[PDB]
């Protein structure tokens, strides 16, 4: 019963007769996945699992680096005392499922418990070979195209009364996300308010499970860098930052139609994988089109003495990306066997 | 060697506008929360809020949201404090302080020297 | 929200004697995080004690720290004369109104 360090290794379904950049590295870097995987259900033990601590983040995290680094091709690079030019043409780009596999003398522990907080036992454990097949969607404030509750919605944080600990909230049902650039940088994302409002009673409930009989309020972002602030993604090779005001403006207490978000696709960005700026060429022509999952949430509450009301309030943060692989690797672990 | 260097003390009037520097040496700034705090006379610490320097990211106290501005330059590694609307009791010593550890960011080591600011007409 | 009440708010000892300071948390806050701290005058404050009981580096021997997770008390076993200062206990962002330590005489 140990967390010990295996170089994992990736599998994969991609299919060589695809120009999207997630296939080709995958058919390079991984193998194809087991047509009859086999999940083997355990003594019924307690194994302490650690979200926040599970160093398959790290990997998962240098892949999609990698996968980055060879597959983007901004056009310009600023990194420490150097600027890189290069040419840089446009890709196709849609993320695939990749599963992590341990290597011989391994394995990976799987926690099935429904209500498994992030940290702590699990009490329904199981070992596999592979993960799930995980699309390493990278963005802010809203995951996307992820992992649903099965039960119902689950609150995580490595310490929820630290407010300097990031909040991940995990759906259990999706909320579906249209984001369209009209057939140049003025686009626009459609989410049912009814839908978002009905959801965002069930987040606040759930929220107030620990800070009991609180109002518990959603507000926009307080400040920092635009990958911050905004929501930020991407849909065939573009950055689209959307605002986000509209989505997060609401109080819910004890107690259709769209929102569309205005969007622009921007060619300068500050870098998720490393500090510095990218350039990127103007957005292509034709009608550019994604529809996404919203699967959860990335929130960060307000620290501090109580003023007056005893509201609470959560503000979308995010931006290191581990978190984002954390809301979909908090089930597993790897282990050495006996 | 961990070291936080401050701008040195200013005056400043009633609704005026104050910016307080934190010089960062001897780690990855990128790495560890920023805090600032403040200590009036005769009163008790303050936390004003936080700020993460990778992305920027803040946390502001319930006081002084609409007051205060966080920001940070991570090419020469030096964080700054921005307030606006002074009134003659935000007069205090101005500390910025990071924690040694990781896994609880809020066990102070590190301090900034302090600076001085007052506000008067 | 944590509310901790430090006391007494001036402590009064001759040097030499052991002192034993008081913070009182308005609910259950565990023993994992607290904190308490040294400020001398025109200095910034100093940790002290970090986890309850775990004395930093430098700090001497004669400061011992323990707590039920709710209150929490820190031991100066023989007070020295440069320990009498303002102390203040800390968990997260909350403070104590502090603590000064002082000569009789």
């Known amino acids: 019963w140990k967390e010990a360090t295996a170089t994992l290794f990736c599998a994969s379904d991609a299919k060589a007769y695809e120009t999207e950049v997630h296939n080709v590295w995958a058919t390079h870097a991984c193998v194809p996945t087991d047509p009859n995987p086999q999940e083997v259900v355990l003594e019924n033990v307690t194994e302490n699992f650690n979200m926040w601590k599970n160093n398959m983040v790290e990997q998962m995290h240098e892949d999609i680096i990698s996968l980055w680094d060879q597959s983007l091709k901004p056009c310009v690079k600023l990194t420490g005392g150097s600027v890189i030019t290069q040419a840089c043409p446009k890709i196709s780009f849609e993320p695939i499922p990749i599963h992590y596999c341990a290597p011989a003398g391994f394995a990976i522990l799987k926690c099935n418990d429904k209500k498994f907080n992030g940290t702590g036992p699990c009490t329904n454990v199981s070992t596999v070979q592979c993960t799930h097949g995980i699309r390493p969607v990278v963005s802010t404030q809203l995951l996307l195209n992820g992992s649903l509750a099965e039960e119902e919605i689950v609150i995580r944080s490595e310490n929820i009364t630290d407010n300097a600990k990031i909040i991940i909230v995990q759906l259990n049902e999706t909320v579906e996300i249209n984001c369209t650039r009209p057939n140049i940088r003025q686009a626009h994302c459609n989410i049912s308010k009814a839908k978002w409002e009905n959801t965002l009673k069930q987040i606040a409930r759930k929220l107030r499970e620990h800070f009991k009989n609180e109002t518990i309020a959603f507000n926009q972002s307080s400040g920092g860098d635009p990958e911050i602030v905004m929501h930020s993604f991407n849909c065939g090779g573009e950055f689209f930052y959307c605002n986000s005001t509209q989505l997060f403006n609401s109080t819910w207490t004890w107690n259709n139609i769209n929102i569309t978000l205005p969007c622009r696709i921007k060619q300068i960005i500050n870098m998720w994988q490393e500090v510095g700026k990218a350039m990127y060429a103007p957005p292509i022509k034709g009608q550019i089109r994604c529809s996404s999952n919203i699967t959860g949430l990335l929130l960060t509450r307000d620290g501090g003495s109580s003023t007056n009301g005893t509201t609470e309030t959560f503000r979308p943060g995010g931006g290191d990306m581990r978190d984002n692989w954390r809301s979909e690797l908090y089930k597993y672990k790897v282990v050495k066997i006996e | 060697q961990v070291q936080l260097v401050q701008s040195g003390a200013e005056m400043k009037k009633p609704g005026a506008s104050v910016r307080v520097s934190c010089e960062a040496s001897?780690?990855?700034?990128?790495?560890?929360?920023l805090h600032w705090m403040r200590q009036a006379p005769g009163q008790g610490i303050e936390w004003l809020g936080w700020?993460?320097?990778?992305?920027?990211?803040?946390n502001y106290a319930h006081k002084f949201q609409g007051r205060v501005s966080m920001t940070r330059d991570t090419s020469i590694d030096t964080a700054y404090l921005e307030l606006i609307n002074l009134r003659s009791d935000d007069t205090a010593i101005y500390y910025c302080?990071?924690?040694?550890?990781?896994?609880?960011?809020?066990?102070?080591?590190?301090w900034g020297q302090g600076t001085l600011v007052s506000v008067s007409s | 929200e944590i509310v901790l009440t430090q006391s007494p708010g001036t402590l009064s000892l001759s040097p030499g004697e052991r002192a034993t300071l008081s913070c009182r948390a308005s609910?259950?806050?565990?023993?994992?995080?607290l904190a308490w701290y040294q400020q001398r005058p025109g200095q910034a404050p100093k940790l002290l004690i970090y986890?309850?009981?775990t004395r930093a580096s430098g700090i001497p021997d004669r400061f011992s720290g323990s707590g039920s997770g709710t209150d929490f008390t820190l031991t100066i076993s023989r007070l020295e004369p440069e320990d009498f200062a303002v102390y203040y206990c800390?968990?997260?962002?909350?403070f104590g109104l502090g603590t000064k330590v002082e000569i009789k005489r």
């Open positions: 800390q968990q997260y962002e909350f």
């Open positions: 700020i993460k320097p990778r992305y920027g990211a803040v």
């Open positions: 302080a990071r924690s040694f550890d990781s896994d609880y960011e809020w066990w102070f080591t590190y």
């Open positions: 609910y259950f806050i565990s023993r994992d995080y």
């Open positions: 986890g309850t009981t």
């Open positions: 001897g780690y990855t700034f990128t790495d560890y929360v």
